[PDB]
Nucleic acid binder design. Structure first.
Ligand SMILES: CN[C@@H]1[C@@H](O)[C@@H](O[C@@H]2[C@@H](O)[C@H](O[C@H]3O[C@H]([C@@H](C)O)[C@@H](O)[C@H](O)[C@H]3N)[C@@H](N)C[C@H]2N)OC[C@]1(C)O
Lengths: 185, 51, 171, 60, 230, 159
RNA sequence: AGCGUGCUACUUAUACUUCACCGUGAUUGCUGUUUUGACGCUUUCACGAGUAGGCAGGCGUGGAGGUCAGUGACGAAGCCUU
RNA sequence: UUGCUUAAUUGAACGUGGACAAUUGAAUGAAGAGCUUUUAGUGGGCCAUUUUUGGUAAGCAGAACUGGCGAUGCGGGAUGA
RNA sequence: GCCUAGACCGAGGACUGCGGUUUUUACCUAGGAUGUUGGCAUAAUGAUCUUAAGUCGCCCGUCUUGAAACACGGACCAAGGA
């Protein structure tokens, strides 16, 4: 026998491949698995793990967030990398000339990038023109902005949103939420 | 592919420990010690026998 | 052969008050040195208010028999514990070594008094040198002039299971 | 008729040690909720002034 | 092409290995001298203690040996029905199976640790030949969380060479003389996986060596037990 | 019926020491507590205000808040399978500094001084503490100290 | 062949040691030889009890889209059979 | 720095700048650490050593810590949770 | 250090490594069994079925702290059955 100091036969708990069956995503995984295996640039390994991520773990990245990243001191010429969708933002006043590498561009985002003289490229083109991720800047979208996240960890005095179907004065605003109705939690 | 015991395999013994050649050549395992004959207990230490 | 006689010498660890603490010696009958030092500390913790952690063993030495092929009579003084109480007793043994007599004593107290080794303190083992010192008739009867005796009814040990000749016990 | 076991803590430490017992995480800055309101009020101004002074000296 | 292509490869290997052996002969001379020097200091330490013991008798004194600095601890109890505190202690000693053995450097801290594990282990002070035999026959290294046989000095140099351990004899010397990098050398060794003793234990194991059992500190008879189990 | 009131079970824990009743010596009120200080909690039964619950009697914690007559102390409490951080308001009569910390700060100063001495000397010293090691070899003289033999003694009654 | 006690050998568990094989988990490397499986191949190590229960990978049945220009009155399907 | 505090140029809390480097300040271990969501079954227990209450006592009734059985075969205790 | 009696195993499959002997860009016992001989192929050999012998083996399902139970359902078979 053995007095085990840890649970036996535990899987790593990390995704090792895309759950997706998109053949072209698999082609990209193939390219970046080669790159992460043969190049030891940390960027390629990060990109490889990113290609495995599920949809909610790849939030869309707006062009305004990209522009704020491009305004960082020394970053006006970096190649912006997004493993996910780049979306348009109609709140933006101006957008600069930039090279953005992404999985997907919405039509508005691509029109705005191209109109200001920039370049909208895919991840294989990025690998060809920067095999080690030289002069890149990875940008990630906000994971916790999801509406589902509002209801996580709900409980007394926690300040989270209730799971509720209708909104109004008759819907869960009485006893338990008001000192005039018993107590407030 | 196969662990070999140096205490049995002479070649593996030499691979791990080059000095094992000199130890055998010099007969270190059966070395005479040069000394004289003394009895340091012939006095008080003979309180080992009786008090 | 079960036992050896040891001297064990120990002292208290030196401190500032007592730079040269007094050396003490015990004669111990033990199977090996580990038990010998254990017994030394057992008796030192009874006799004195000392512990093993505040002391040290100085020396452990076999005490060989002086005349291993001389027949002797030993008197042994003992303290043992019964099921019911605590008793002193004195018994005599014939042997050629002190360790042989002590081993016989342990067998004898196991047999007649059901005294285990843990229940017995050996107060003193003394070679009785004058025949007048021998007090017990069960050993005294082997100290008479021209002792001779037969060994009636000899039983021969057989190698085979079946013997073709009738048994004999002559001798 | 319905008499049963009333209470025991048997097996309770065994359950507690399957995933516990975890210490709360420590942070460099603690929350000042629950600290004396007069101290906390002035500490707000002290931090605000320090940033303004550092933002000044860095210019020169 | 293939016989030609493989012959051309064979020559490049054959010339490159010619360079390596010359580089390995200077390193093998280094570990040869260390092993010879270790032998000399083992012999001088034994003789010096013998001379001191003799001189003490003549000068009406008693020589007291230095206390042992090293123990070898063998777990001889199974894995069921262990109270939590000794269970945790046995885990912290890397003794998680029966007949597992590790080397421990004696201090007050580790002595009280072993004290907590006493009714489940047999321990004592290993001789140099005991350590040598254990390491040579059942010595394994922890290389990237893997039990790797110590079949070559390269395996030892790659993992412990940064602590100036270049050979199996360096490792044995570090264990036997409780040296400066004892922690790293002892932890690099996988727990020794011994057999049951040829000849069995005493009639009943689970009582102290002093009371006629097999547990506790037996102090030089650990070597006979290792010969039985190794 | 059972009884589980606030001070149940505190008959002896909250008693004053024998011949130690009455007025509090003023040294209790002259001590200065700062956020981050480590304090032992001990309830004084003669000060009914700002008292600890019996759980915190004999516990040690960090000071996190300082008010007119009291300190706020952080205590970790095992609740089920985890610790909960507790915040207890205690008047200074129920609080005292912890001495181990003063010892540790002294050691910090000594380590710094020794390291500076070695750096000025040109060498390196070891600052880690060590457990007690086995003793080395030694020679014992028998001058006026001949080993004296002891034996177990016979049983005697004295009743 | 009882009781107390010491000793020598011996007997044998799914336990321990070495080795083989299955699986699980981790792990080494694999594109100018990546070769139509890279969901693949390959190096190495450790581990394997299980009710209630969770999950994974498979086996089997009726019917539907596609494909094998599939089997079949020279015998389909069913049924019996060391 | 401050609107708090001191008779104060005193403090308090948080800082700029400077210095102290692998002995970064005990041991041993560490199939790594942290974090989140979601959902099953269960919510009759019972036994042993020790501590322990009621009862003459109980294979009785009720607590404490740990180990077990339940959920588990295997060698031994003839047989047996 | 030396001599000597038995047992079980032979995973892998060009080469590549570490060492040794050096008499040698060589050879080795050193990164896992080869050499040789006899017999057989109308068969020595292996598997299954039937039966004998040795050894072990209570009746499943279920509720239950606890079932082989002198606890309950079940004579048997097909098809249906959540
Ligand atoms: C000196 N204090 C002791 C305390 O140490 C403890 O003693 C136990 C003793 O009771 C155990 O003995 C116990 O358990 C054994 C067996 C089932 O293990 C039983 O045979 C025995 O009847 C039972 N009393 C004994 N084996 C070890 C001592 N430390 O419990 C009894 C005690 C008097 O409180």
């Amino acid at each position: 026998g053995r007095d085990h100091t840890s649970k036996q036969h535990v899987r790593s708990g990390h995704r090792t491949a895309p759950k997706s069956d998109n053949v072209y995503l698999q082609l990209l995984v193939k390219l970046y698995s080669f790159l992460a295996r043969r190049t030891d640039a940390p960027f390629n390994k990060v990109i490889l793990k990113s290609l495995f991520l599920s949809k909610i773990n790849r939030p869309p990245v707006s062009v305004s967030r990209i522009s704020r990243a491009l305004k960082q001191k020394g970053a006006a010429e970096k190649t912006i990398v997004v493993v996910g969708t780049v979306t348009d933002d109609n709140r933006l006043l101006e957008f600069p000339k930039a090279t953005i590498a992404a999985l997907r561009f919405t039509a508005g985002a691509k029109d705005r990038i191209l109109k200001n003289g920039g370049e909208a490229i895919t991840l294989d083109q990025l690998a060809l023109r920067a095999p080690k991720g030289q002069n890149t800047l990875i940008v990630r979208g906000p994971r916790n902005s999801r509406e589902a996240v509002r209801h996580f960890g709900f409980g007394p005095h926690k300040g989270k949103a209730p799971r509720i179907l209708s909104k109004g004065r008759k819907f869960e605003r009485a006893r338990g939420r008001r000192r005039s109705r018993g107590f407030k939690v | 592919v196969l662990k070999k015991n140096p205490l049995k395999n002479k070649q593996v013994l030499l691979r791990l420990n080059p000095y094992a050649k000199a130890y055998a050549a010099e007969k270190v395992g059966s070395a005479k010690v040069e000394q004289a004959k003394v009895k340091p207990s012939k006095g008080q230490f003979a309180e080992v026998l009786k008090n | 052969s079960r036992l050896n006689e040891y001297q064990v010498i120990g002292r208290n660890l030196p401190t500032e008050s007592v730079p040269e603490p007094k050396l003490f010696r015990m004669r111990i009958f033990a199977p090996n040195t580990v038990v010998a030092k254990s017994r030394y500390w057992y008796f030192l913790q009874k006799l004195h208010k000392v512990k093993k952690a505040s002391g040290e063993i100085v020396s452990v030495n076999i005490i060989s028999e002086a005349k291993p092929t001389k027949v002797k009579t030993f008197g042994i003084w003992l303290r043992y514990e019964s099921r019911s109480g605590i008793h002193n007793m004195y018994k005599e043994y014939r042997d050629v070594t002190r360790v042989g007599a002590v081993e016989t004593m342990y067998q004898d107290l196991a047999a007649r008094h059901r005294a285990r080794f843990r229940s017995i303190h050996i107060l003193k083992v003394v070679e009785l040198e004058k025949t007048d010192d021998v007090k017990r008739q069960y050993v005294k009867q082997f100290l008479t002039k021209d002792l001779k005796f037969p060994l009636p009814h000899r039983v021969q040990k057989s190698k085979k299971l079946f013997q073709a000749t009738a048994p004999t016990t002559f001798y | 008729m319905a008499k049963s076991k009333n209470h025991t803590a048997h097996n309770q430490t065994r359950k507690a040690h399957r995933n516990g017992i975890k210490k709360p995480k420590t942070y460099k800055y603690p929350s000042l909720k629950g600290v004396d309101a007069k101290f906390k009020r002035n500490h707000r101004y002290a931090l605000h002034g320090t940033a303004k002074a550092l933002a000044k000296a860095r210019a020169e | 092409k293939k016989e030609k292509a493989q012959q051309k490869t064979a020559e490049e290997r054959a010339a490159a290995k010619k360079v390596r052996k010359a580089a390995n002969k200077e390193k093998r001379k280094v570990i040869f001298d260390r092993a010879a020097a270790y032998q000399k200091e083992y012999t001088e330490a034994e003789r010096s203690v013998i001379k001191a013991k003799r001189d003490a008798k003549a000068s009406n004194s008693y020589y007291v040996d230095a206390q042992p600095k090293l123990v070898f601890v063998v777990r001889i109890k199974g894995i069921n029905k262990i109270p939590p505190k000794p269970r945790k202690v046995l885990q912290l000693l890397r003794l998680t199976q029966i007949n597992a053995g590790v080397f421990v450097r004696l201090t007050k801290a580790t002595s009280e640790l072993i004290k907590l594990a006493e009714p489940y282990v047999a321990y004592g002070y290993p001789s140099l030949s005991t350590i040598r035999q254990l390491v040579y026959k059942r010595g394994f290294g922890k290389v990237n969380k893997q039990r790797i046989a110590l079949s070559d000095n390269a395996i030892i140099e790659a993992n412990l060479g940064k602590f100036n351990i270049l050979s199996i004899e360096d490792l044995i010397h570090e264990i036997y003389t409780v040296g400066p990098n004892f922690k790293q050398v002892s932890n690099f060794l996988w727990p020794f996986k011994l057999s049951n003793p040829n000849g069995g234990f005493r009639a009943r194991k689970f009582q102290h060596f002093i009371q006629g059992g097999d547990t506790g500190n037996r102090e030089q008879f650990i070597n006979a037990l290792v010969k039985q189990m190794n | 019926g059972k009884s589980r009131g606030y001070r149940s079970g505190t008959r002896y824990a909250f008693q004053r020491d024998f011949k130690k009743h009455g007025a509090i010596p003023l040294s209790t009120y002259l001590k200065v507590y700062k956020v981050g200080d480590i304090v032992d909690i001990k309830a004084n039964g003669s000060i009914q205000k700002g008292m600890p619950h019996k759980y915190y009697h004999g516990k040690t914690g960090i000071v996190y808040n300082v008010t007119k007559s009291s300190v706020g102390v952080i205590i970790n409490k095992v609740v089920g399978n985890r610790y909960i951080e507790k915040r207890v308001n205690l008047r200074v009569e129920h609080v005292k500094h912890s001495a181990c910390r003063q010892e540790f700060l002294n050691r910090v100063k000594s380590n710094a001084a020794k390291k500076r001495e070695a750096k000025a000397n040109g060498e390196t010293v070891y600052l880690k503490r060590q457990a007690a090691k086995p003793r080395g070899s030694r020679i014992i003289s028998t001058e006026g100290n001949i080993p004296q033999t002891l034996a177990p003694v016979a049983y005697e009654t004295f009743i």
